[PDB]
């Protein structure tokens, strides 16, 4: 159904070590398609998915110019923010930026966002209406006034509602073979005795795309979120995701417990039950 394009940018200052680190990455849903790294040899926007490789030298020359203008903006911003907070030149600081657009199952514009963080905290965000800003503190109000005076919101909104959704549609068509896929989790349950009175049940979800999933244990149809050991969804490294959830049960009572799997790739949610 719904799809997204997102760009992520990090800038880290290097006290007494010259130019800041800069890393830019682009995603369609959970699939990285481009990157730029200041530490890499090319100093170009590079492809990271097969379907973007077919874009011509005009695309690559244009993305290179625009990523370097982002780099230059972040370069100035780290100096400006050190000024705004009167921080010493001795310490490393971080700017993070994320922007992008969501489309619905009709591939029509659903929402756009632009967030900016200084040292791991909200600094300024575009509001849902894409017409104004929320500034976290007194320093960010300075930025907010500069962006109002220069009508950034109007030109950012034209990108998020226009260009962003048009190129997302182009990429979805050019990448159909891999971007439009939903891979349902391959699921199984393991059972390991801990003692003569207790046992661990572990519910596995493997080879799923996208990353969004719910794994939940119920006892007699009632949630067990107090006693569930849960790992964070993790990349397999081949474009799919893995997750597991475990519960410690009394021996002889395994059949009271059900593992519930919800995923976009499933016609309907799975219930799994241990049977010897």
């Amino acid at each position: 159904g719904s799809h997204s394009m997102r760009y992520f940018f990090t800038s880290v200052s290097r006290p007494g070590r010259g130019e800041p680190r800069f890393i830019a990455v682009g995603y369609v849903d959970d699939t990285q398609f481009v990157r730029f790294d200041s530490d890499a040899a090319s100093q170009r926007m590079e492809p990271r998915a097969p379907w973007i490789e077919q874009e011509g030298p005009e695309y690559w020359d244009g993305e290179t110019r625009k990523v370097k203008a982002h780099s230059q903006t972040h370069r100035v911003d780290l100096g400006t923010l050190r000024g705004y907070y009167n921080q010493s030149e001795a310490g490393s600081h971080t700017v993070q930026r994320m922007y992008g657009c969501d489309v619905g199952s009709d591939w029509r514009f659903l929402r756009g966002y632009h967030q900016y963080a200084y040292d791991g905290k909200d600094y300024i965000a575009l509001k849902e209406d894409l017409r104004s800003w929320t500034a976290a503190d007194m320093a960010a109000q300075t930025t907010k006034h500069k962006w109002e005076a220069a009508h950034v919101a109007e030109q950012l909104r034209a990108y998020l509602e226009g260009t962003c959704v048009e190129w997302l549609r182009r990429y979805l068509e050019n990448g159909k073979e891999t971007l439009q896929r939903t891979d349902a989790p391959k699921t199984h349950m393991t059972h390991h005795a801990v003692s003569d009175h207790e046992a661990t049940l572990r519910c596995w979800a493997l080879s799923f795309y996208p990353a969004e999933i719910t794994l939940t244990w119920q006892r007699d149809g009632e949630d067990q979120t107090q006693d569930t050991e849960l790992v964070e969804t993790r990349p397999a490294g081949d474009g799919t995701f893995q997750k597991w959830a475990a519960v410690v049960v009394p021996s002889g009572q395994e059949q009271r417990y059900t593992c519930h799997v919800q995923h976009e790739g499933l016609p309907k949610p799975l219930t799994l039950r241990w049977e010897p």
Partner: peptide
């Protein structure tokens, strides 16, 4: 495709 309009804070 990148936004071409980012502005200094």
């Amino acid at each position: 495709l990148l936004w071409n309009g980012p502005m200094q804070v």
